[PDB]
Amino acid sequence: PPYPASPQVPLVEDHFGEKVSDPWRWLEADVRTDAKVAAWVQAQSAYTAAYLKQLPERAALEKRMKALIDYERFGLPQRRGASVFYSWNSGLMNQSQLLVRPADAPVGTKGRVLLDPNTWATALDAWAASDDGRLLAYSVQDGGSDWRTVKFVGVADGKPLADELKWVKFSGLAWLGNDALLYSRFAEPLNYNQTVWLHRLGTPQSADQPVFATPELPKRGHGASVSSDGRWVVITSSEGTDPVNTVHVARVTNGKIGPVTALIPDLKAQWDFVDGVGDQLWFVSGDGAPLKKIVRVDLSGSTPRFDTVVPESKDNLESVGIAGNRLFASYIHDAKSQVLAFDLDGKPAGAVSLPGIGSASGLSGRPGDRHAYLSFSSFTQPATVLALDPATAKTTPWEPVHLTFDPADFRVEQVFYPSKDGTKVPMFIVRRKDAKGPLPTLLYGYGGFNVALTPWFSAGFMTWIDSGGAFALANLRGGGEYGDAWHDAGRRDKKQNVFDDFIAAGEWLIANGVTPRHGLAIEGGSNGGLLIGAVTNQRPDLFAAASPAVGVMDMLRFDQFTAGRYWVDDYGYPEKEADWRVLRRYSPYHNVRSGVDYPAILVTTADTDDRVVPGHSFKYTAALQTAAIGPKPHLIRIEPIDKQIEETADVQAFLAHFTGLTPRPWSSVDKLAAALEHHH
């Protein structure tokens, strides 16, 4: 049916000797105060909703996505004494509970509820079990205050102790053995003069002992940790969001904290404390190492000795933990996690075996303990705790998690493909194990602002994959996957490289049998919506369908709105001639090409948006609907978890319809059952 009207107010301006037409500038006005925009929004929204309600793929997609949202989650466990402590959510609870059970209880034994914050406006922030596991300290936030109250519970019976610590803020919780706790606090009244104190259990807070302050440095913050064997206090101090810190240490002898001395006295680099064993401490250091390194500090001598036990590599070092007798170092290796193991002195001990390609978050475990744990997630694996045997560097399943699918029924693959200029770009391809040929494919990208698109679990993407579609994600230049050079290679005058990389991804998938010639759909949001708009103008023949969300579509005027002036660092400056010419070559709103058949396009945005003003999407839609670009629908869907499910179902039904995807279930369980029926 014919599109709703998009009246033009003719307007042509001179910019750098060129004429620029902008007939829909009126669509930049706020929908809340401009009748003309409100009327257009109401008409387009109703027009799109009427079309989308007709797509027969929608029902099955909405049902799949709803079923994927809510599931149980386990936190990384902490073993102390006779007990193991871990958070658990059923999938339904506003806050996780803290559970505890005997350390030797079988995996899968229901834990005892130690804290249930849902029965308390009052949130559990942090918790720490004592060294022997008999007491638990926890931090409580009332409302949205930055202040905390630290409270304690006895673990055996789950009953509160009397002790409460007030005026705690921006603090750790660190036990000094079994009956004292280091914490940071401020004066009972401005975040000045934060101080580290020691609380002894069974005494009032007024009996607490001061441990560390910097009385000539009022803006300096201080957090305290204790090595796992209780031998060293380590105080990390910083000021003002630069990722650098000082380090002070104090020897603990017979429960008593010795003099606090400066180990790294100046604010020059990142020094993140890992743990200590004996009189050796390990840190992740940024000193002379943008991608970080591991430094061992030996304090047994009269002067600290620094040894780099794992030097800076080619890969970014994200985090390090110690477990068993080893260091476990989580790196970003070709846009995904590689966890390497080392002896404490740096000797390589190989890579940790992971279930497949994905992202590793934290590690839990202790020196001398044979049970360690690693958090893992990927496109077909919601974040899960794996058991890690630190002596063999092998992961295995820990607690079973009930999901509506089996992660082993899917495969994440990674390829590296040449862009126009020969640059090898990584791409992930994710498919259910019934895929035995070309499939309708959803290709996602962002490509900007140093954003690294490492694997994560998206319920929306999983809906597509578990409906029989292929998913692909390209780690385009402009991102942070290979650091600052990668970012610089896709911004400013080189922004077009991002678009070439993405077009080459699309070509590769077709050429290499992942996707049919007419079965490629593309999606992206914000800077990723610009990506979609730009490649749609340049190669409309490559894509069956496209959905730009909240896209920056007018690249000549992006800095005229709210927040968009901050984006000049990647996009350049429209007031500058040379930067303007670069922008004019790809601004999606200014590059719609009549006479050429465009893909089906579903633009999405809310009717107000502080980050990317909706006017970008509104004017871009008016341009597409006005242009002579063939018969496929060029539509705008104009809008909490409930809203996101509806949007995802609409978008995916649209993309499925235009790529030939018929949503179908499959599982290896059902394949086996089908195979066995024949033998009767």
Could you write a compact summary of the structure shown?
The chain is of the alpha+beta class. Helix content is 18%, strand content 35%. The strands form 9 sheets. It has an 8-stranded mixed β-sheet with strand order 33-34-36-35-37-38-39-40, with helices on both faces. Strands 3, 4, 5, 6 and 7 form a 5-stranded antiparallel β-sheet that branches. Strands 16, 17, 18, 19 and 20 form a 5-stranded antiparallel β-sheet that branches.
CATH architecture of the largest domain: 3-Layer(aba) Sandwich
> CATH superfamily name of the largest domain?
Alpha/Beta hydrolase fold, catalytic domain
Helix fraction by DSSP (H/I, runs of at least 4): 10-25%
Which class of secondary structure composition applies to the elements? Answer: alpha+beta
First-residue to last-residue Cα separation: 54 Å
Rg calculated over all Cα atoms: 28 Å
Within the largest sheet, what's the order of strands?
A: 33-34-36-35-37-38-39-40
The rough form would be described as globular
Number of helices: 11
The CATH class label of the largest domain is: Alpha Beta
What name does the CATH topology of the largest domain carry? Rossmann fold
The total tally of domains equals 2
Give the percentage of residues in beta strands.
Answer: 25-35%
Largest sheet: 8 strands, mixed
Q: What oligomerization state is this entry in?
A: monomer
Total DSSP E strands:
40
